[PDB]
Amino acid sequence: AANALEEANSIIEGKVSSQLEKLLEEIKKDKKSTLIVSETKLANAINKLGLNFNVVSDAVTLDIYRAIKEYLPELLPGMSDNDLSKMSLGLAHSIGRHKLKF
Amino acid sequence: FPELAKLVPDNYTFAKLVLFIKDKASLNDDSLHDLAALLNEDSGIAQRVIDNARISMGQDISETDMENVCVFAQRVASLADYRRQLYDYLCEKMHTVAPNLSELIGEVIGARLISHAGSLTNLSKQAASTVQILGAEKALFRKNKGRISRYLANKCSMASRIDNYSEEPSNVFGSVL
Amino acid sequence: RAVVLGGDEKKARSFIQKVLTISKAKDSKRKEQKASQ
Amino acid sequence: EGTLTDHERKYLNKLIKRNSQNLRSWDLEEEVRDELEDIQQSILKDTVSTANTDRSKRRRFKRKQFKE
Amino acid sequence: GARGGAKVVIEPHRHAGVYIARGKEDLLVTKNMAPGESVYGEKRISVEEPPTKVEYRVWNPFRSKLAAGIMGGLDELFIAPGKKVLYLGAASGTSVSHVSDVVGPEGVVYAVEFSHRPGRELISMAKKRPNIIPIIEDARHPQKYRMLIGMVDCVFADVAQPDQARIIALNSHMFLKDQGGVVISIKANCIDSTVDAETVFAREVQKLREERIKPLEQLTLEPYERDHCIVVGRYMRS
Amino acid sequence: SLAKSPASTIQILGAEKALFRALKTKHDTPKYGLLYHASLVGQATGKNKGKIARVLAAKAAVSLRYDALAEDRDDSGDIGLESRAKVENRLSQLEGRDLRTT
Amino acid sequence: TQDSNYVRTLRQIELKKLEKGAKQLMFKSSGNHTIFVDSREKMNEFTPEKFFNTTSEMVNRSENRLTKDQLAKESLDKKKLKKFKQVKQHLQRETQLKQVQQRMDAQRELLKKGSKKKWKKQRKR
RNA sequence: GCGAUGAUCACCCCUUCUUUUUUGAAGGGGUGGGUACAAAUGGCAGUCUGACAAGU
């Protein structure tokens, strides 16, 4: 949860976390691949890294992200809908405490 | 960590596990076995507490607060141990003081009957009818049900006399009674 | 002095006056008979 | 599946009458509503107040208009 | 009046998860997810059911605008048991808790709120309700809390902002299901105070149409509120 | 909830049984409440106890409101300390007053 | 025969007592309801029975319009009029106490030390 | 195969047909009360006054 809050805060701030650095670097072997990102701020941040990715953040992509979020529990084997909801509940309180300067 | 209070309703068990799980952040496989040793894994709480601890809405409290949760829990833990010791002391003392009465009804019930009378001397002086209503408020002796309760009250009155007016009471008459 | 009272206090005040009138009636009757004798 | 014969669409219509009839008892008679509603407006108008906001709305409308 | 020892008869509403207490007085009511306590001091009604004690909470129309919608005879309320709801403008648990009651344990409620002082109150209530997910963030930027919210069945907004139709659109596009619900509480004064309230409501309806939200019905909230109305629409992505 | 209370209530906060009995029966009201056990009140004597309770209650609300409603409060108590000095000065000049004519 | 402190306490009791009593009551909605329809032919054929899926009697009841599919006392109501009247009676008492307190407030104000020309404009030292 | 070391002793859930005929056939639960403990952000229940005071 401590890591999740740190990763959650980086996403909100539009900054790239080290956990996301490593994950992208794994796919770096693929030359000239386009990266679809939900948020423009994150898209710009990923571009600055010098990764060989054409980063795109367009209104049309919102349909892709929209379908994925609908069928996310089925997309991710091994995690049920209840677990994702119960993970969201715990992470939300942790973020709310940080935002409220608790 | 509010979730644990639901997992382990048994309060005495809850305190012991709280002493081990001081901080929900600390979760190791070896620790899982150690808390698995606490009580049994048949309920499965050993796996649940690890899963809940990783992800929960509990707000971390200060180190000073945690010091009092454990220290206050030690006070509760000690009292339970002493209560068990005092209970065993009661049973032994009931046998020597009131062997006939303790044998007939029991050490705890007989001791409560003595307290309601105010003393063993008071109990032995009462008539059988008064002894029955002496334990008619906590249901100590409890239409056919009423007959036994009255019958047991008369025998309890007799047993209290053998205990009170004997220098070294035996349990021989309480057994046949 | 003027006051504003709740229901229970009114009942309590109503009851005590009823008692006081009955006592005054019982006392006066007791006096009159002994005066007659 | 909408296979209602004539008999089912009559038994149900009685149930509609049965249930609708019962709720009228809770709904209450019309006569008391006449007095009850009068009390409600009295209890409302003061507690909500809002006599002023009618005036403020008129004032704000009056100030803006060009005066000649 | 409807005093502590008073006895009432509880019967169901048209809307699933909503109930009325008969007696002398008819009170709008919801079951308590966290029995034994009231979040904002509302009255509770006790019924013994085989015996376990199920509790109820009174829904005050003067404190919740959604409740004033039910009193007015709202035809359709997408908020129903076993549905996800995104509550925008969740100042505190006064109305979200009652929404949390309707959705029940299976459903969830995403309570979004911005100001910090009411936010801390919202967190304190969310702890008692596992089905409430509080988000202390500005609704004008749904991308910030995109991670925490999944797709939702309905979107209810009480935000009293001039640009609320924009806020509703951004959240609906990102989180609302196709053919999903949209219930908007509109305060005329916050948007435009000089004109009459009827003109303001017509303008808000036009904005929602531009954002692909089909209005279904509208209802003024008198006498519970003045210059207020609730608009219910369905989200037509197609 | 304490910060939103006027200093008058903080003065008589713990004496509600006596307060409302006095108000309804046309009698004098209490003047110390729960603050009677504060150190500064004890230092006062005679009728000065009633006066210091009024002064100390007023400064308590100032210090308390700063504690509750300050976003970036330092954990030093500097507002409380300077408030204490004002009450001590008020006590000194109030005590130095001699009712008996010299 | 009473003082200002006594009257103030009574009114404060009634105000809170009034607030509780009002919250206990229910008040029937009087708001306007409008239905949005797609086409004029749909507008003309609209009727309250079809739109809400009802019988006629439920249409009049805005507060608990049960659907037709879902469908498929003088002493008692005298207490209702008693309930609403008590909240009205707390109201009449509260304003009557308000009138008394203002008169007591005015008298104490007239007793206050001031220029009192009507108050002359004079800053108080 | 008894007993003075003690027997006995609140509420509610005639009709039709027929006859060798005076003959045959058919029609445990809920309330209430008592005792002890625990919880209520349930009730009583309403949070004093408001510009002068002290010295020459």
UniProtKB/Swiss-Prot annotation, chain B:
Q: Which of the residues bear the PTM Phosphoserine?
A: S119
Superkingdom classification of source:
Eukaryota
Give compartment(s): Nucleus, Nucleolus
Which part of the chain is the Nop domain?
97-177
Its biological purpose is as follows: Required for 60S ribosomal subunit synthesis.
General remark: Present with 13500 molecules/cell in log phase SD medium.
The UniProt subunit note reads as follows: Interacts with NOP1 and NOP58. Component of the ribosomal small subunit (SSU) processome composed of at least 40 protein subunits and snoRNA U3.
Similarity comment: Belongs to the NOP5/NOP56 family.
Task: Indicate what this protein is called per its UniProt record.
Answer: Nucleolar protein 56
Species: Saccharomyces cerevisiae (strain ATCC 204508 / S288c) (Baker's yeast)
Q: Which residues of the full protein are shown?
A: 203 to 404 of 504
From Swiss-Prot, chain C:
Q: Which residues form the signal peptide?
A: none
Subcellular location as annotated? Cytoplasm; Nucleus, Nucleolus
Ranges of compositional bias, category Basic and acidic residues:
26-37
Q: Which domain of life is it from?
A: Eukaryota
Query: Subunit arrangement?
Result: Interacts directly with RCL1 and the U3 snoRNA to form a stable subcomplex. Component of the 90S small subunit processome also known as 90S pre-ribosome that consists of the 35S pre-rRNA, early-associating ribosomal proteins most of which are part of the small ribosomal subunit, the U3 snoRNA and associated proteins.
**Function of the protein:** GTPase required for synthesis of 40S ribosomal subunits and for processing the 35S pre-rRNA at sites A0, A1, and A2. Controls access of pre-ribosomal RNA intermediates to RCL1 during ribosome biogenesis by binding of RCL1 in a GTP-dependent manner and, via its affinity to U3 snoRNA, delivering it to pre-ribosomes. GTP-binding and/or GTP hydrolysis may induce conformational rearrangements within the BMS1-RCL1 complex allowing the interaction of RCL1 with its RNA substrate. Required for RCL1 import into the nucleus.
Q: Which family would the database say this protein is a member of?
A: Belongs to the TRAFAC class translation factor GTPase superfamily. Bms1-like GTPase family. BMS1 subfamily.
Query: Can you name this protein?
Result: Ribosome biogenesis protein BMS1
Q: Which organism is it from?
A: Saccharomyces cerevisiae (strain ATCC 204508 / S288c)
Upper classification of the source organism reads: Eukaryota, Fungi, Dikarya, Ascomycota, Saccharomycotina
From Swiss-Prot, chain F:
Domain Nop, chain residue ranges per copy: 1-96
Give compartment(s).
Answer: Nucleus, Nucleolus
Q: In terms of domain of life, where is this protein from?
A: Eukaryota
Q: What else is known?
A: Present with 34700 molecules/cell in log phase SD medium.
Q: What does this protein do?
A: Required for pre-18S rRNA processing. May bind microtubules.
Indicate the family of this protein. Belongs to the NOP5/NOP56 family.
> Can you state the subunit structure given in the record?
Interacts with SIK1/NOP56 and NOP1. Interacts with the trimethylguanosine synthase TGS1. Component of the ribosomal small subunit (SSU) processome composed of at least 40 protein subunits and snoRNA U3.
Give the protein name, as stated in the record. Nucleolar protein 58
Origin species: Saccharomyces cerevisiae (strain ATCC 204508 / S288c)
Swiss-Prot record, chain G:
Report the locations given in the UniProt record.
Nucleus, Nucleolus
**Is Repressor a UniProt keyword of this protein?**
no
Nucleus as a keyword? yes
Report the domain of life of the source organism: Eukaryota
A GO CC term assigned to this protein in UniProt: small-subunit processome
What is the first-listed, main subcellular location in coarse terms? Answer: nucleus
Give the signal peptide as a residue range, or say none if absent.
none
What are the entry keywords? Nucleus, Ribonucleoprotein, Ribosome biogenesis, rRNA processing
Quaternary structure note: Component of the ribosomal small subunit (SSU) processome composed of at least 40 protein subunits and snoRNA U3. Interacts with snoRNA U3. Interacts with EBP2, FAF1, MPP10, RPS16A and RRP14.
- State the protein's purpose: Involved in nucleolar processing of pre-18S ribosomal RNA.
UniProt-recorded name of the protein: U3 small nucleolar RNA-associated protein 11
* Boundaries of the shown chain within the full protein: 101 to 250 of 250
